[PDB]
Amino acid sequence: LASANVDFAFSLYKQLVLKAPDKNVIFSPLSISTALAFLSLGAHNTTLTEILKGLKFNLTETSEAEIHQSFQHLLRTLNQSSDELQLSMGNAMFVKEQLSLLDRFTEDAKRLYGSEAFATDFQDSAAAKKLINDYVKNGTRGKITDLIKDLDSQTMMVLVNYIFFKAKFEMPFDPQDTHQSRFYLSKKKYVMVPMMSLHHLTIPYFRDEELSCTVVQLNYTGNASALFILPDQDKMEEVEAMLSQETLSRFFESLEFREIGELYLPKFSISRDYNLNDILLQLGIEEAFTSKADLSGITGARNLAVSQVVHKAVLDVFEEGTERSAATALEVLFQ
């Protein structure tokens, strides 16, 4: 259940890195998993099994009904507000106004994924784009505003997921202690960045001499936490080669509380956007993109196929805390 979403996370991470191995990578695997599981609610036969297997689910262990329930239960715990944590996730479908959808699909989409259905005039491409981008901007509180750049005027449907996360550091950095410091892109290339610093703090800690990396857990109490993995210089690629659910488990299990004299962390903002067609096809989600697509659980006919999958994510790290946002859109054409 959770094991699936993590195997998919690391498979996707490695594919993302392979496309550009020295670039920043930021993404939400849950956003992508949720959007594709939502799509699978409408899929049948090989289109369906490829999606769920591509998400790394074992259909002999868990049925389709049980998978959607898992997403439903998870979705309801990711909409929270407190003095420490703002979390919100939404799903939506934007549908050509005249297109007939099965009652079962729209009922299931709202009950299991919280998705409304929005009538959309895709032939007016600029208005349809603004309608979807505004939904995502509203859901991510301004952080993701251009998820959709180009939109085929003959689009039939767009399925959208967004996630918004804002969390304050339990022990905040004092802005007076943020100073420009070197950041080493490699042993021999470095730039100056604002570097925040904290003194004398006790956090979960693990020094993995075998993997040449240090692992710490910031903001560990509560509903969420951040696991930071710091490879020794020139050892990022070796650390990436070991990433897996098993290695992540051993990281967590090996953590122990430890007083840290000084911690240095950059203050920064980065964003990435992706078209995931190549990667999803590599992960075996293939029939959904061809004229053999079976999305007849959506409309009652095999008259829809996926055209584009896009993802954008934004990360902000500052003295008081972090903000993370991501969104995924699945664009669907007629066939």
């Binding site: 991470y13 920043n24 710490v216 007083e259 950059p266």
Partner: protein, 34 residues
């Protein structure tokens, strides 16, 4: 006397402490990289 200095590429994995799901994952290779 332990120092943890994120002045080189690093990874972040954001999790739910109860469901063990991964909300976000990042590799920061250059925090100034536009």
């Amino acid at each position: 006397r332990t120092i943890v200095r994120f002045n080189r590429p690093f990874l972040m994995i954001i999790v739910d402490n109860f469901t063990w799901s991964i909300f976000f994952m990042s590799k920061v290779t250059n925090p100034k990289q536009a």
